[model samples]
Structures are given as structure tokens and as C-alpha cells.
Target chain A: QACKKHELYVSFRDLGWQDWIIAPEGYAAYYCEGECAFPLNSYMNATNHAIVQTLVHFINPETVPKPCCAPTQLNAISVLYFDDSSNVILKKYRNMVVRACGCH
Target chain B: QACKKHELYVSFRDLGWQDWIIAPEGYAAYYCEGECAFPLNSYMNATNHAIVQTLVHFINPETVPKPCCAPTQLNAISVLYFDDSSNVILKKYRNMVVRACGCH
Candidate 1:
């Protein structure tokens, strides 16, 4: 019926990266998935642009591209990992997790 | 019918800031303005979130805030200006211009 953001925990150990990542075995990455039909709401965090885009498609189905459910805001996660030089380094992984979702 | 991005050249001279800003007397700072109603399309760059949100509100008007027309992507502009000490300075103004527009 609508797009929604769901929780998703990503474990470094699960990806077999635990050997390189020394800290924080796992964290919630989150995800956004769902339908983008008619009718948007506050929970969906839609904008007027998408609203109108839907209408345009409704008028000419094949002419325009349909909207998609995606992350509206993403956050970074800091991780301690071994560098190519074998040095333990702490760095922030950008766009590492989905913070919020919306239609686009 | 949908939110659209329009050209907007902002002249520092027009804003009476020419006295400080020496370079880039003006720049094209586009804007997004329009309506967000039913039937969004490609032109609107609507997302599934917004599409669903619109549908959600259609069934229950006034319960949720409607979408708004706004810039989805903005860019920075560099300007050479005179600082408080009368010294010429150069800086980049982030999010100074609209690059793209889309529905949330």
C-alpha cells in the first residue's frame, strides 16, 4: 500500500569482515521498501513533487517514469578496521545506513 | 500540475551586496515552485513515498500535512568579497543555488 523503512542489523562478522573490523560486531543499517501507489501521507514523508509526478504518470502511463521507494536520509557509521598497510584505523563509513525513507 | 524548477539569477548588485562581493556579480540560483496534487509524473520527480503519502491523505484530508515544492539538490557558489577588515576574501557559499527539484 505504501513505502516504509524497516530495521536491518548488519554484522561485520556475518560479512566475514570481522577479521579486519576490530570493533562493533554489528549495527542496525535499516532499509526502505514498499509500494508507491496512489495516496501519500505524513508517515510516508512525501513531497509535492512526487505527488504531481504520480498524477503525470496516471495521465500517460508509459510516458513517464514511476516513483520509487528509497532512503530519504542516510547516516554514516564509524568503524575500526585494518588499513592496507596493516595499520588499525578508525574511519566513518558514509551512506552506510538508512536513517529515513521516502518516495522519489 | 506539478512542482517545477525555474531559473532565478540572483544578482549581488540587485541585493545591494556589490560593495562587498567583488567577483561573481551574479549567479543563477534556480528555485522550485509549483503545486503538488494528485497525478504526479516524471517531470515532478515524484517518489513512491510521496505517491503513497498523497494517497493516504486523499482518503483522510487535513489529518496529515501535504507535500511542498522544494529543491531536492542544491549547489554551492564561490564569491570573492571584502571581509570586515576591508580585506578581500574568497569563499564558497554552500547550498547557494538550486540544482534540482523533486517530490519528497
Candidate 2:
């Protein structure tokens, strides 16, 4: 069997001001882990990571689950946000910078 | 006499995710100029620029007013934001980067 889960860490920064800003609770963001989760293998790649209610949450590697191993990737950072309501995600409002992820 | 007033521009970014975020209205932020607002000169160094109401607002360079010229500094950016209410400012909550300012 292949690995089916990935763990992610997050950080924030201020753009126009070029500094770090703390995200409020229930923000939405996205992430990319390079080419590790490629070729339709188990533990696929996770691109859209949302901050719904909790400051941190998990995402499926792909539309569905696959098999893989516990490999960690560096720089999987993204800008999370919400509009209208805390659960409403505003896609692509920011850029992805530095975050790390692991699949098992 | 010294130049006492300065105009400021603001921007926002997510830290944990490493992306840019939009700041709500009535946010508070701060700014700093290099050497130009030195020696108790007019338009004292505006170290605390705030985003009280409008996204773009003005601040006093120093506690008191002085004499100076209409000089614009590059990279006077700041992370504008508010606390409990849109009118409440959370000082140093974020970093200041890439803002421009003009003193007169």
C-alpha cells in the first residue's frame, strides 16, 4: 500500500510593507509541493490548503487518495484568506512562499 | 520650523503562508524614513504611521512640527490593520516594508 496523508506547516508575511502579519482565525490559502507527488502515485500533490476556522488544516494530495511514502518537502507556503464569511475561501488572493510538507 | 506632515501608502501579506493579503478599512500602520527626518527637523521622522480610516492616510513625522521640503522617500510601505474595532490600532502587530512618503 502507498502513503495517504501529508502534513503541512504555515507562516505569513506583509507584502506592500514587506513584513510578517498574523492571520486571523478561519483564513483560506493554497500550497504546491513541487514534483514529488507527480505521476499519479499514492499521496498525490496538495495544491489548495484552506484555513477554515482552525489556523491549520489538511488537504487531499489529489482529487482522490493514492499510495506513497513519508517524504517531506520544503517551501510549501501560501497566502490564506476568506471573504464574506469565515468559511468562504477567496482563491489566489496572495502568493505562496515558504512552507514544508510531508507525505506518508 | 520643520515639515510636520507626511503621506503614507500601505500593503498587506500573509506570514505563515508567505503571500500578500488585503487589509480591511480603518486599519492602523506605521512608517520610517532614512535620515531625512533627522535632528528634530521639520516633518520629523514619522515612525508611527497609522491606517485609522482610509487605506491611504497621513501622519506627523514627529511629535512636534518642524520645517522641511517636499521630499518623497521610496519603500515607505507598512502593514496597515486594526484591533478590536476598525478604529483601534494594534501597534507593531506587523512589519513595515516598501512604503513611500512625502513631507512638506
Candidate 3:
């Protein structure tokens, strides 16, 4: 069995690099962990991560499970909030700083 | 006999000194100790304490509640951030250098 269950997909636009946010079916995708849960592995980009971090960072890390461990090859999307809601770039992988993880 | 009720009004714009928000009640005020509560004194400025410090600083400040305290003739208004969510700032009170607060 693979120690992994998802892929770090990424994408970009004139705005910047946005993490590819959906990996289709049976492709092993992880959803954005939130106060509530959604059916799809909803988390598919950096913009989402930022929002999660903003709200999550303000909450207890212990209680909230981290989304997914960065696979060996993390898909980094560099950039910052380019909008009030949605449509933002996460920049490059090198730009993505890992704050914490499960095994950690 | 007068200990104190509440009075530390401060205003500022131009993106550096945005702290005062809502304070129009019987005068005596204090509240923000949350999970939930509403009845004036909710918080008058600093963009709702920066969205309640980005979601109650991620929750559980000894179980939440950090509104009052800090009163002492403030009311500075340096200015910096033009605007995004709301007016914001705190350039003067903070030091370029880090230092502890408390009369040790």
C-alpha cells in the first residue's frame, strides 16, 4: 500500500500560482478540513489553505486535524490574497512554508 | 472612591493607527470574552481586533476573552495600510524592537 493517499496538484494564472484544487475521483484527494465537512476533498489550492490557516491558526491545532501531510513532492503555489474572497495565488512551492504536520 | 470603569479612547487612520472601534454605551464597558455574547461593548475598532485576532487567536485563550485592559491614555493614530477589510494600524505603540510589557 502507498504511504500516500493524495497528490499535491498545482496551477497558476495571471493572478499567480493557484494549487490545483481537485484531483477527480479515486485519484486520492484530500478535502479542506473545516468546522464542517464537505463531501469532496474540497481543499485544492493555496488560497484555501490561507483561509484555513487564518481561521484554524486562531483555533487549537490539537483539536483540529491537519489536512494532509505534504507528500514528498509538495505542489507549492506562491502569491498572496489577490482578492477579498477566492481567486488568489499561493506562489511557488519554495514559497510555501510548512508550519506543521501530523507526524510532527 | 474611584477605581476605574473604562476610558482609553484612541483613533487613527492613514493606515497606521486603527484601534478605537465601538464605545457608545452607559460608558462603563467590557466584552469580547467569547464563544458568544452581544450587548454593546462588543468592540469598537481595530477591525474587530483583527477579526478577533484572526479567530480568537485560533481559539482557547484560557477558553476565550480578551477585550478590555490596555486603557491608559492611548488614542494614537500613526497609519499605514490603505484598506482591505477595514481601516487598520498600530505603528506607534509597537517598538521596532521587542520588549515585554508589565511593571516588573
Candidate 4:
């Protein structure tokens, strides 16, 4: 059989940060050649993708000012809200770790 | 250009349950025709995908016992560990809402 490579895209709410915000919301994708890469190697793969795409699609519907939820892209885990009034993030979530093991 | 329809996948950890486990730890995919779907159309798209895929591939590694984190697929949000000692899930998470709007 041929070796298979896998990839996936993620977002904030996709990682359980609904109340949080992201930076220039877009979208990100990952590609694996050899084995499996961190974070993207679990059952969480599918659901995560859906969440991000869905979140942006709805919130950022592609209008003027760009939906505050416009789709943003990132290579690793990104954070939105760290604490109250921490909206300095305003709408920017920092990328988190894409551990080779479990995300947690 | 042509109109573009989007889709996404999801999981528990992908939705921020990094500490919890998933069901069969596989992967899932989704598709849309009209507009973006919920929980998927957000900046969280890329990171979430990378996280789930990475997490599963690392833990499962295509071995027996399946690394307990094999890539599982889903169309919506999933849950892993609601509480401690809730291993009946042993490694199972329930799917969350995939609103036609933002995931949260």
C-alpha cells in the first residue's frame, strides 16, 4: 500500500475557547508526510475542523467590516481569553501547542 | 470566481477537552453547500485540525490497543472527560452542537 499523509485545520472554539477571541481570524492547515504529527493525530481531528469552519462561516459571513468571527488560520493551539478584561486579545487568540502526544 | 462551499470536522479535545479522551479516537469530516457551517467557520479552523490529528496520530501510532488515541472522525463537537474517574468513557466523547451559525 502507499504511505498516507494527513492534514487538518483548527480554530479557537474548536479547542474549547468559545468565549475567547482570535487574531485576524482566517484558517490554518497541517500536512504530515512521514508518520502522524502532534495534536492532529487523534479522534479530535474531524470535530475540530468542523468547529472552526462552522464558527467562522456563521460569525464572519463575509460582509463588510469582516465578521468579527472571520476565519483565521494558525499552525498550533491558539488562545482567545485568558482572564476577565483580558480582551486585549480583543479578537486575537494566541496559538497553543500542537504536542506530538495528546493535546492536553 | 465561483461560489465556495465549506466544511469541517470536530471532536472533544478539538472543542477544548484536551484532558478528556474520545470514542475510538478516530476522525470525521463534514461538507456544506450553501454557506459556512457552525463551529467550523471560525479562525479556530486550522489549529483545531492540527491538534486532533496530531494528538491521535501520536497516541494511536497505528498499534494494537490503538494508542488509545487513534484518529476518530466526527461531524460536530464531541466531549471527552466531563469529570475525573469517568473512564466508562474510558476513551469516548459525545458530539456537541454544529449550529448553522457560530459554534459557540
TM-score of chain B of each: 0.84, 0.20, 0.19, 0.27
- Tens-digit lDDT string for candidate 3 (A3-85): 12222221233113243432211111121112222221333222222223223333544423322222112222333544445
Interface root-mean-square deviation of model 3 in angstroms is 17.9
Per-residue lDDT tens digits for candidate 2, residues A62-92, read: 2222211212232222333544444544343
Candidate achieving the largest DockQ: 4
Q: Give candidate 4 regions above 4 Å deviation.
A: A1-5, A24-26, A33-83, A90-104, B1-51, B54-104
lDDT by candidate, in order shown: 0.66, 0.26, 0.25, 0.33
Instruction: Report the number of the highest-TM-score candidate.
Output: 1
- Estimate candidate 4's alpha-carbon lDDT, on a 0 to 1 scale: 0.33
Please tell me the interface RMSD, in Å, for model 2: 21.4
Per-residue lDDT tens digits for candidate 4, residues A1-104, read 11122334444445444454545233443433222222233442334433344443444445111111111223343344446665454333344322222211
Tens digits of per-residue lDDT, candidate 1, A4-104, equal: 87665656665557688888897776656676557777778755445544554575565343455667886777988888899999988766666787765
Give lDDT tens digits, candidate 3, residues B52-83.
32233235444223222111121222324434
Candidate 2 at A78: error in angstroms? 54
Instruction: Write model 2 residue lDDT over B1-104, tens digit each, in one string.
Output: 33322223221222232232234322222222232233433334322111110011123222222211212232222333443444544243322221333322
lDDT of 3: 0.25
- Give candidate 1 regions above 4 Å deviation: A84-86, B1-104
| Docking quality tier of model 3 | incorrect
